[PDB]
């Protein structure tokens, strides 16, 4: 629907802004991007809603938009007798002619669904040709003229020119005329009065008395459709309760502001004298179901959906998002293994070259997210291997591999679990239990660390974290992710051990264990492994 930019600022008589006009419309029900200009007039087009016919024309639309932002006010089966009535005199121009043609092009095809004169100048089988052509045809032989192009063929029929194919044979005033008597016929006698009242005040903006109609309506009050023409504006009312709307709109306790909103949206409420009732008067310019739903829709538009006060089923879970890791891990041929509960002291301290504890851990509250030292010990039990809880579970994993020395060459395993260490500070129970995961590869002959790298990046690819360098490459090809920094830890083989980093928070390690440890664990074949947090 063409804006005709200056036509707006004229019909409204205001000057504010471009973005504060698209702004107001956006705060109203219509909004459109993809709106272009012709030559020297920059225009736009907008998808008016098909709930009400009052916004079809730029005239009614601009008028309602005026009323909106606190500016404007209101104005003041064989069918028997189809109605085609208008007033006597009016006035036309081009800038209104182009617009009057628009309803004829939209109102008929769009709303009329293949559409199931207006001259009053020189006014009260085959005779002549409608407008442009000069031909006749006595019966029905006419489809031969032009039927494939944009014609009436696509609205032929279903089982005084014609309703669906306007022809204007006898009369027509002019494109540049002064008297007008609009006509239209329809399928049945209900929408008739509607369409007449709409055309009526639709264009009464272009009339000599500025929305005033002769029609000499001041005699009777009853049309028998027999003597009235052969020898219109009816409104309705919808009562509305207030607690209903208060509940719906989520902002309540006022009842006069309802009247103010309904004034500002061209409604004219009526204040059903109780504190909790209205009798709002719906005119013809609305075709919205009488139920107060749409009434509250207007009240809410006017209050502005944004300005409802209220705001308050939580994060609640991580171990549901661990199954992600689990699935992605077993997708890579990795099998799950459940380690033993606890490990020998020397199994995690003396076998691996471990000095464990820095309890104080200079940071006052150690590290919420961080790898594990400062282990949690145990009181002696009847068992011979239940001396301490895990601190890095991989060792038990390693122990497991010392158990099955005949299986397939590439042994690929992993594990999620809870581990525990000692905590001095505000940590309850003076001890902490955090979840980690470690994974390991081994082949009878060669190594890992090529695979393990692919595995790591693949796990981290469903989360976007990328190796400090892949993001570069992509930048080189078109953040808030990790990086692997080589470090030095005795348990792993030199030049083949790397810590991981994010916020400079180390949480994982990746390495080739030193052969001495393999000697410790009665192993023969080289293994590689990684140990990473998740809570991080």
């Amino acid at each position: 629907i063409s804006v005709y930019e200056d036509d707006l600022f004229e019909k409204l008589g205001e000057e504010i802004i471009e973005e504060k006009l698209l702004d107001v419309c956006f705060d109203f029900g219509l909004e459109v991007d993809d709106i272009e200009y012709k030559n020297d007039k920059k225009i736009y087009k907008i998808e008016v809603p098909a709930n009400r016919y009052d916004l079809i024309c730029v005239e009614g639309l601009c008028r309602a938009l005026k009323n909106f932002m606190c500016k404007f006010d209101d104005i003041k089966d064989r069918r028997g007798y189809v109605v085609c009535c208008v007033l006597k005199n009016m006035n036309i121009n081009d800038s209104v002619y182009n617009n009057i043609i628009e309803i004829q092009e939209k109102l008929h095809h769009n709303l009329g669904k293949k559409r199931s004169i207006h001259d009053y100048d020189k006014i009260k089988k085959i005779n002549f040709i409608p407008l442009n052509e000069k031909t006749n045809l006595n019966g029905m032989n006419l489809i031969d003229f032009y039927s494939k192009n944009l014609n009436l063929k696509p609205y032929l029929k279903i089982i005084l020119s014609l309703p669906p194919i306007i022809n204007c044979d006898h009369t027509k005033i002019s494109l540049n005329t002064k008297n007008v008597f609009i006509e239209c016929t329809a399928i049945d006698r209900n929408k008739a009065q509607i369409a007449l009242n709409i055309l009526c005040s639709m264009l009464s903006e272009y009339c000599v008395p500025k929305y005033s109609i002769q029609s000499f309506v001041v005699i009777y009050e009853n049309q028998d459709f027999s003597d009235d023409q052969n020898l219109i504006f009816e409104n309705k009312s919808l009562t509305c309760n207030i607690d209903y709307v208060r509940k719906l709109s989520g902002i309540s306790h006022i009842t006069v502001h309802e009247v103010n909103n309904l004034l500002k949206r061209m409604m004219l409420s009526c204040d059903i004298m109780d504190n909790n009732t209205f009798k709002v008067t719906i005119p013809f310019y609305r075709s919205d179901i009488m139920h107060c739903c749409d009434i509250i829709e207007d009240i809410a538009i006017a209050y502005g959906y944004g300005n409802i006060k209220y705001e308050p089923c939580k994060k609640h879970s991580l171990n549901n998002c661990s199954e992600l890791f689990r699935n992605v891990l077993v997708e890579c041929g990795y099998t799950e293994v459940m380690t033993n509960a606890l490990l020998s002291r020397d199994e995690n301290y003396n076998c691996m070259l471990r000095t464990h504890k820095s309890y104080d851990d200079p940071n006052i509250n150690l590290d919420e997210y961080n790898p594990l030292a400062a282990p949690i010990q145990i009181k002696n039990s009847k068992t011979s291997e239940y001396e301490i809880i895990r601190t890095s579970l991989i060792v038990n994993l390693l122990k497991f591999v010392s158990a099955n020395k005949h299986r397939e060459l590439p042994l690929r395993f992993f594990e999620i679990g809870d581990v525990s260490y000692a905590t001095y500070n505000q940590t309850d129970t003076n001890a902490v239990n955090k979840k980690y995961l470690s994974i390991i590869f081994s082949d009878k002959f060669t190594a890992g660390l090529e695979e393990l790298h692919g595995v790591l990046e693949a796990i981290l690819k469903e989360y976007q974290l990328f190796s400090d360098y892949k993001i570069e490459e992509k930048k080189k090809e078109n953040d808030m992710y990790y990086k692997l920094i080589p470090k030095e830890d005795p348990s792993f083989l030199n030049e083949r051990i790397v810590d991981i980093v994010l916020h400079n928070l180390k949480f994982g390690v990746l390495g080739i264990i030193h052969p001495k440890v393999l000697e410790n664990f009665s192993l023969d074949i080289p293994v590689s492994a990684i140990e990473i947090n998740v809570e991080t």
Binding site: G29, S249, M290, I296, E311, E331, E450, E495
Partner: protein, 290 residues
């Protein structure tokens, strides 16, 4: 470089990109997003409805949702119509065969107006391919209806549905003929917009932490509706992320639910968020070919 021969006789770095990817077997992305959504939905405390059918008659599809048949949906330019089992039979012969709805179509209930329309049955009986998953949803509502009367209590229920849906707009690069829509609906007595606004806020917070803004629209299933958009800096600095609306007591109280019952619903695409998520620019690769 790589160490082996770890026997005692051991006589004695490009951390740049990666190591050779070998056979990798993965799941469809849309299925992963569907998973994530099920997680968060059940996390809020929701119940999965059963939309395991996409044939639903026009009746459940359209007239149960109080929409006159004569509208841009019914036209073939925006829908898909089956002809093989074009007629159905099992419908609740009660409430004059839901002739209540026709009446509501033609005349008034709950003080509202219809259309002064005949609202014939045949168009309701034409079998259609679902264009709104909500159709299936609304069915599961009516059972609750009976339950509510069979019990007289008020039990606020939370529901959500996801399954393939279909439309036929064109074949121009806009959006495709089948897609997937997640949908949520809550039901209870005397609840209004504020709850809807808040729950959208929380939900679309789980998808990301974005202050939201919504503009009114006009739609027949929800008389009070809005289009929701929240901010994750896309092009206009946000995205028209979702659709919404509030209930429709006109048809609602004609299902026997209650005078005080209100429900809220909202629906959206599953693909379009995916397109946004995994760094995608147009919908031709997640679906079908890779």
């Amino acid at each position: 470089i790589n160490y082996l021969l770890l026997k005692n006789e051991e006589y004695k770095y490009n951390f740049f990109s990666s190591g050779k990817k070998i056979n990798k077997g993965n799941i469809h992305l849309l299925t992963k997003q569907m998973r994530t959504f099920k997680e968060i939905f059940f996390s809020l405390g929701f119940e999965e409805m059963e939309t395991h059918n996409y044939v639903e008659s026009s009746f459940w599809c359209f007239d149960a949702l109080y929409i006159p048949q004569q509208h841009p949906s019914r036209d073939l330019q925006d829908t898909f119509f089956i002809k093989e089992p074009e007629t159905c039979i099992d419908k609740f012969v009660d409430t004059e065969y839901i002739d209540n709805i026709k009446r509501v179509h033609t005349h008034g209930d709950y003080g509202s107006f219809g259309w002064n329309y005949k609202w014939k049955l045949e168009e309701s009986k034409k079998n259609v391919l679902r264009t709104h998953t909500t159709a299936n949803s609304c069915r599961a509502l009516f059972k609750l209806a009976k339950e509510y009367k069979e019990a007289g209590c008020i039990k606020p229920k939370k529901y959500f549905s996801i399954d393939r849906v279909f439309r036929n707009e064109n074949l121009d690069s806009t959006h495709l003929a089948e897609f997937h829509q997640v949908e949520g609906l809550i039901i209870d007595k005397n609840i209004g917009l504020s709850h809807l606004i808040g729950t959208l806020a929380a939900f679309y917070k789980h998808i990301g932490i974005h202050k939201l803004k919504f503009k009114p629209t006009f739609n027949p299933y929800t008389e009070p509706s809005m289009e929701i958009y929240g901010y994750h800096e896309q092009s206009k600095k946000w995205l028209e992320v979702g659709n919404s609306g509030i209930f429709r007591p006109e048809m609602l109280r004609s299902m026997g639910f209650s005078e005080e019952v209100s429900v809220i619903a909202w629906g959206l695409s599953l693909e379009r968020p995916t397109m946004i998520k995994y760094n995608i620019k147009n919908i031709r690769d997640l679906f079908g070919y890779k």
